[PDB]
Amino acid sequence: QVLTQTPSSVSAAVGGTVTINCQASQSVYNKNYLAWYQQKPGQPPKRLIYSASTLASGVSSRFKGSGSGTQFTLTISDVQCDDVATYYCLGSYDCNRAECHAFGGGTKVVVEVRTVAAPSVFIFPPSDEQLKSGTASVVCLLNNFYPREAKVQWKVDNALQSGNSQESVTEQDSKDSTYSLSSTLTLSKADYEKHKVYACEVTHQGLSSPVTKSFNRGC
Amino acid sequence: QSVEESGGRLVTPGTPLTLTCTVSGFSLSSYPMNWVRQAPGKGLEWIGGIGTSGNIWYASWAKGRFIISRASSTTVDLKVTSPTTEDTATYFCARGLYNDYTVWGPGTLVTVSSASTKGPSVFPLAPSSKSTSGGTAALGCLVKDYFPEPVTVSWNSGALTSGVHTFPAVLQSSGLYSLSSVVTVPSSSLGTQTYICNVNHKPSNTKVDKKVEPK
């Protein structure tokens, strides 16, 4: 048995509804042995529903399971920020006849809010401690923004940089629905001390124009 | 009733590795027990389990790669017979999987690589203090060049949780991880309340406390 979930990703409005579909390649045990799980980053999966439609103790009534045989649906009503998670269906079978269990591939749920939030932007030079070691990391922080789309461009003596930075983004915050992002420009010590102005330029919907933070070395 | 996994570590490909699931507050023989894994950023995959019958079942794909057993009165083990890089994953054990007695452990992380264990360097991300951009200032710690995952970061020994963002680790071209942790604080605290990031990389026995301050 293989279970296929669709869509693989949903972005939905707070207070709206999401629908997640699960199709089994073969009929689950008794036609209803299909469970739904919710998982957040770094946490064990939490059981929401079993036997297709039976809500697990401790779970919100906003989660509703439906379907039978090979076609099943999870519906999340009145979507809340803390619904941001990945959802999995779990089909179970008589081990004597089929794979005992099979998980679907997962559906990520993200939420959309009405109010745009501009990032607060900060730039951090490499520490002297690190410079001694032969390398320079320059860090740009974009703090608590929404929506997710953001462009960071590094400039060194106004020369546009490419291929020498990496970004990391937080998971959507389950309270205010914002994201934070770090961009790290990595340079050798020799190169760092060669150039003067280091600048991070941020483009985002909440900013009236691109914001540049810079320094000279010297729900 | 609970379960807890243990034995997750860095192992070179080909080296046998055994994980253990320890049960608390129930009889292991009275409930089904299951092992499930999850590769970083990927989905849950059922490996195998033990019925209340005592019968031990495997997923099709897990056959020949894993052996499960009742190792003691309070433990079930999972032996990975010849680990490959594709076995890098968090491994969970569970009592049940769909019934009301279902409980899962927090998971144990297996990293399969020939790369060396390496502790991080921790560098300050010093507050600008140039001028107040609203009333608050950003500071942090760069945790660079470690392997394997994971690193944990706290601030002021747990007493500062508000406005903290610890970013997902990024794998550098060198094959070593790096991450930053940042916090925003009232900007009128920079020359009065001391700020220290508490970094722990258990895999290398490296614990660091870095005071971050205005330069």
Binding site: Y29, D94, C95, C100, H101 | P32, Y98, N99
Partner: peptide
Amino acid sequence: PAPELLG
């Protein structure tokens, strides 16, 4: 042949 279930 009685069903064998592991949930």
